[PDB]
Design a protein around this nucleic acid. Structure first.
Length: 401
RNA sequence: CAUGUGCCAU
């Protein structure tokens, strides 16, 4: 595959082969897509480069559209393109603006195809990270705004381009991605997907006013807050679909677990989880969300949650004597009951705070623990047959000390 | 029932 003027009598490259010989020969494309040839170029381009060698490298690697696209989508050549891009941005000569402008053009024209390509998406992320801000923002504007943007968010490779944008580009230049994701149909498709949920999760974290965003100005905080409220509105409106989904349940858990998103935790608990705890506790994926709600709900909402379990309506009653008995022995609900019991034991033993709003809720935790202990005592025979039941009994048996 | 799900990609 390599041109014969570069091989040995054994079929390998000559030791005294130089970078200028490859650049002057016009056969760089044959080396860059070859295994051992690309690695020669990888070592060569990181040595000392004369003015003309940079001239030749820039032209042949990032100066021709078809050659640039062909190398960016190659299993080996994509590494060479990333190396030359880095050299081009560290070489502040005359054509520093021409080369970066041309590089923008080559990428913008084939933005969707290279995002979806396993190897060219690496060129996108490297360019977003190292290009000047004003140039990197032009690549962001080149992202599609239709159904192709959904395919990017759910692609195994293209989703990292969106994650890179979120990480290194200011929110002002990718706010349209937030409002695209917050569109209900797009949110449904994206949050039902393995890679799409990580994209939405990364967006939520960046839009959170936590310790990592304290460096923002007031204008950047206001912009971030408005984008957060819009996205949270769509998330909370589809909370039932998301909490029960195999992938989106991690997003609802993150929101409920994050103190810096407390307003949306309480919104999720009321609009979605309340009056549905019994049904959701028997769900494979939503039961994890119910555990998080019990762990992190404010004490006023927690009291309503406890009261819903202890004296809750069972519409269309069949099996189980009450909601507590159903959950106590259900294959998934038993983890919720263990969570309820551990919360109450931690509160009674001074391991969990019982004061909120200035008033102590210890008397309520005492009442909930008394109900659970009374139930576990009367059910001890059947609980002894289950792993969960053994742990519930031991939890109450260890609180005696 | 000694029990119940991910992303982390050349």
């Amino acid at each position: 595959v390599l041109p014969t003027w570069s091989l040995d009598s054994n079929g390998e490259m000559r030791s005294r082969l130089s970078l200028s010989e490859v650049l002057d020969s016009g056969d760089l494309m044959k080396f860059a897509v070859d295994k051992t040839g690309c690695q020669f170029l990888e070592k060569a381009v990181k040595g000392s480069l004369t003015s003309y060698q940079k001239f030749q490298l820039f032209e042949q690697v990032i100066g021709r559209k078809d050659d640039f696209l062909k190398l960016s989508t190659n299993i080996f050549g994509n590494y060479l393109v990333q190396s030359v891009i880095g050299i081009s941005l560290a070489t502040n000569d005359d054509g520093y603006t021409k080369r970066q402008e041309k590089l923008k053009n080559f990428i913008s024209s084939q933005m969707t195809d290279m995002c979806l390509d396993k190897f060219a998406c690496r060129v996108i992320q490297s360019s977003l990270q190292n290009m000047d801000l004003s140039l990197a923002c032009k690549l962001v504007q080149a992202l599609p705004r239709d159904a192709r943007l959904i395919a990017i968010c759910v692609d195994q490779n293209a989703n990292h381009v969106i994650q890179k944008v979120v990480a290194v580009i200011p929110l002002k230049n990718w706010e349209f991605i937030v409002d695209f994701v917050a569109t209900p149909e797009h949110l449904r498709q994206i949050c039902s997907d393995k890679y799409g949920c990580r994209v939405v999760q990364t967006i939520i974290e960046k839009l959170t006013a936590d310790s990592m965003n304290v460096d923002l100005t007031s204008a950047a905080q206001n912009l971030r807050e408005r984008a957060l409220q819009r996205l949270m509105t769509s998330v909370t409106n589809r909370c039932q679909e998301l909490a029960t989904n195999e992938y989106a349940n991690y997003i609802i858990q993150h929101i409920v677990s994050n103190d810096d998103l407390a307003v949306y935790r309480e919104c999720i608990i009321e609009k979605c989880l309340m009056r549905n705890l019994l049904s959701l506790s028997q769900e494979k994926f939503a039961s994890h969300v119910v555990e998080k709600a019990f762990l992190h709900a404010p004490l006023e909402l927690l009291a309503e949650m406890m009261d819903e379990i202890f004296d809750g309506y069972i519409p269309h009653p069949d099996t189980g004597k009450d909601a507590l008995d159903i959950m106590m022995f259900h294959q998934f609900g038993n983890y919720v009951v263990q969570c309820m019991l551990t919360i109450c034991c931690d509160a009674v033993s001074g391991r969990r705070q019982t004061k909120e709003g200035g008033y102590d809720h210890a008397i309520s935790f005492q009442d909930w623990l008394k109900k659970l202990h009374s139930r576990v005592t009367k059910e001890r025979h059947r609980l002894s047959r289950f792993s969960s039941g053994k742990k519930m009994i031991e939890t109450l048996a260890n609180l005696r000390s």
